[PDB]
């Protein structure tokens, strides 16, 4: 009913969350190979997807950031700050809204002589949402929330050869998200659902491939992985009331997998490309993802 | 290769073929009043993929449902 | 006389594919200074399942030694 939506509120910006989070070879720059210690990292996304009872969702998020170091005695301690920001909008059976969730925080990253990497991030984001829902008659409403999230990762990638590679990697992100309180009395009834500060913390642990391709006529980052998704913690507990009693829920771990990407190739510093994946697995929970192809020329 | 400005934007737009005593509780679209007005930060530069602009501002003034994306992004 | 050059009008080609509309096309040019001949040349379209869209454009500024310009364009849409 009304309560089971927020559940589908929490598990869809917990795909948010998840489409928030991210690599750190990726969005933070790859933590070797990069000979310019002080200078600007980024990487913007764009995806959708949906899940079974019609909830489907678009969103894209863009982060860039900096950071500046200089040579240590093996050790490749850098740090710098970064800010991101986000849209999405989804559509379900009975409720609709649109959300943005924009945020600023720290980095540091350390890359050793022995070739560890490791990277690390923490933001503060006012994530705000504005969606209607007739479920419980409460109607449209708009409202924010202040997620502190600190997350880091943790890999080893040893030259088995030098274009082809395996690495290990490990990853997780806690933050803190307070919850949201209201009563549908402007109906009649009160109905009152509250939920204090969560803590809620998830991580992923991925084994990868890459290869190490250069001489501007390849000049490719063909990586492949395979990666299982923990919810650390779900504290998304929610109580709802109504006038026959009160209920309580609260949001449950994950054992997620999923996939790789193709090609994402270039030429020159002139052009670019790259290829994505979707992730559509209907036999789960009608789950799906949404990916892109598209490169650039240019005289 | 790089170029930014602090800007004030004023814009305004209207209909002719409009009567008022036809809809007196729908709102009149023929009157050259509503003038939505916006400042801001604006930058431009020049990579070498085409000329990619950014922009942050807020609107100052708005009417009706003027739903505002703060930040701009676009090329050319 | 000593110029420095600098890049005018570029490549482009995109094929998204989704869930929505498919696996929707695009691509297309839009430059002038066409391969350095001094035209002005732009060609773009996009196959999409509910919305295909072309345009094609060819400008000749000085036609005439004076400067006279001949220009002109097709385009095509269904939406």
Redesign the interface.
Known sequence: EATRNAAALFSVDYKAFLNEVNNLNKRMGDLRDINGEAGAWARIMSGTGSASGGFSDNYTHVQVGVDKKHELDGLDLFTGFTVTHTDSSASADVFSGKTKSVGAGLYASAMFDSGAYIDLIGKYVHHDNEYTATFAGLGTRDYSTHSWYAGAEAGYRYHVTEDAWIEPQAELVYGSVSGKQFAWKDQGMHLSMKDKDYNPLIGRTGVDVGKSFSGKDWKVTARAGLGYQFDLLANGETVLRDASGEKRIKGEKDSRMLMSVGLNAEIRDNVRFGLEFEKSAFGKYNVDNAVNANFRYCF | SVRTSFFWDMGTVWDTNWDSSQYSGYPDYSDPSNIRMSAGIALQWMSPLGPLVFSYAQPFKKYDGDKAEQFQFNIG | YKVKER??????????????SGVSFQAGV??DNWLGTGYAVGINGTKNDYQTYAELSVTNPYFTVDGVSLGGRLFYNDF
């Open positions: 890049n005018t009008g570029c490549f482009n080609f995109g094929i998204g594919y989704g869930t929505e839009q430059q």
